[PDB]
Amino acid sequence: GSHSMRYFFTSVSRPGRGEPRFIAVGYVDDTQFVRFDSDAASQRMEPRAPWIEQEGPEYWDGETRKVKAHSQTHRVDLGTLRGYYNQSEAGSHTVQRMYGCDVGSDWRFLRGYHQYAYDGKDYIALKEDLRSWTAADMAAQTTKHKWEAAHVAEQLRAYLEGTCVEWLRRYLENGKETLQRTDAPKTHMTHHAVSDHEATLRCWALSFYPAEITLTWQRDGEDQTQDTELVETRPAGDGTFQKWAAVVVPSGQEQRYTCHVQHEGLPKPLTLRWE
Amino acid sequence: MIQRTPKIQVYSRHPAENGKSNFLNCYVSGFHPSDIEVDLLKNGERIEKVEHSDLSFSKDWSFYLLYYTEFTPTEKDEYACRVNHVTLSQPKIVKWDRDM
Amino acid sequence: NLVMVATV
């Protein structure tokens, strides 16, 4: 359906222990394709998807160039945020920045975004219209002004509506076998006897792509959300995902319960039943 | 100065089949700040050739990481995960239940 | 493909 490109930047100070940690990751949909890590050897932007490896020197030299410009801008930011907030040079603090663009099934621009965060909390963010900002508090107000006076949002809106999406569209072809795929969940159920008056019923979705999925239990057709244990959707490690939902059933009523799976890759919603 | 406690899942990449080689996963997520210490254990001993994904984060800004290592299930060996974080009063250990 | 990069 739709598709997205997103870059994630984690910048963490290490006072009396040197330069800041700076990590950059890049994703198209749920697939990472690149990484930068201040602490690694190459100081290059490295590929983490096999489709991107044959991009060329021009691409790699540029991404490295830019990823290092980010690194530096983030090295300054950490100090500037120490000041805004009147904080000690002793403290280790964290900055986070996420930006990316989305195309619809038309592979036509749909939306862009840019969020910045100091210490796990919203700082400033590009609003949906990509022409104005939302400073979260008093400190971010200074940035909001600074950035409006720099016409920062003009420059972002342009990247997001151009470079961003055109390259998102590029990658979707360069890795069409990976990215335009739809690995439907491999599903099955299990039954353990938590006691002799009870038994755990667990619904498994394995090896699916993308991550978006929905697992739900029912008793007599009626949802058990209140009484269901959902784990977070988790990485299998091979570019697919996993997830399970478990209910406890008083022995005898296994018949009453059903599990339900909704995914992109299923033509019809699966209705599992312990029957 | 927010602070989130790490969520921990210990699981295998493929269904666990004794004698057949696999990858052991320890997925920690929802924590803040980013400093975290994750080990995988085999019978209560640290595994040395363990790797981890690149630091990324969710919609609420909390961080998540996958630690993984090639391994082969046997009837005997008990594998587990050990996680230390600031929000954790003491190193947390989560056993690996192949048959979950 | 990366994006300046303005500081706070």
Domain boundary among the residues A181, A201, A229 is at A181
Q: Any CB–CB contact under 8 A between A166 and chain B? A: no
DSSP B75: S
> Sign of the C-alpha dihedral, residues A265, A248, A228, A29?
negative
- Rounded to whole angstroms, the Cα distance separating A211 from A268 reads 17
Query: For A37-53, b where at least 16 C-beta lie within 10 A, e where not — what string?
Result: bbeeeeeebbbbbebbe
Domain co-membership, A169 together with A123:
yes
Per-residue 3-state assignment (H helix, E strand, C coil) for chain A = CCEEEEEEEEEECCCCCCCCEEEEEEEECCEEEEEEECCCCCCCCEECCCCCCCCCHHHHHHHHHHHHHHHHHHHHHHHHHHHHCCCCCCCCCEEEEEEEEEECCCCCEEEEEEEEEECCEEEEEECCCCCCECCCCHHHHHHHHHHHCCCHHHHHHHHHHHHHHHHHHHHHHHCHHHHCCCCCCEEEEEEECCCCCEEEEEEEEEEECCCCCEEEEEECCCECHHHCEECCCEECCCCCEEEEEEEEEECCCHHHEEEEEECCCCCCCEEEECC
Domain co-membership, A69 together with A91:
yes
DSSP B13: S
Domain of A230: which CATH number? Answer: 2.60.40.10
On chain C, the residues whose CB falls within 8 A of the CB of A67 are 2
Provide the experimental method for this PDB entry. Answer: X-ray
Q: Which of A64, A63, A152, A169 has the alpha carbon at shortest distance from A116?
A: A152
Residue A39 lies in a domain: yes
Counted across chains A and B, CB pairs separated by less than 8 A come out at: 72
Token output for A72? 């530096």
Q: What resolution does the deposited structure have, in angstroms?
A: 2.3
What are the DSSP calls for B20-64, one per residue?
Answer: S-EEEEEEEEEEBSS--EEEEEESSSB-SS-EE---EE-TTS-EE
Give every CB contact of residue A143 below 8 A, 6+ residues apart in sequence: A123, A124, A133, A135, C8
Domain co-membership, A54 together with A176:
yes
Angstroms from B1 CA to nearest CA on chain A: 6
Domain co-membership, A116 together with A147:
yes
Which residue bears the tokens 């050739």? B49
Domain co-membership, A106 together with A214:
no
Residue A275 lies in a domain: no
- Rounded to whole angstroms, the Cα distance separating B52 from B69 reads 9
Query: For A69-88, b where at least 16 C-beta lie within 10 A, e where not — what string?
Result: ebbebbbebbeebbebeeee
Find the helix packing angle between A138-148 and A57-84, rounded to 10°: 130
Which residue range forms the structural domain that includes residue A109?
1-181
Counted domains in chain A: 2
Residue type at position A181: R
Domains of chain B from N-terminus onward = 2-99 (2.60.40.10)
Domain co-membership, A211 together with A137:
no
Contact A234, B27 (CB under 8 A): yes
Domain of A63: which CATH number? Answer: 3.30.500.10
Domain boundary among the residues A164, A181, A198 is at A181
Return the H-helix or E-strand segment holding B95: strand B92-95
Closest-CA residue of A relative to B65 is A235
**Cβ–Cβ of A123/C8 closer than 8 Å?**
yes
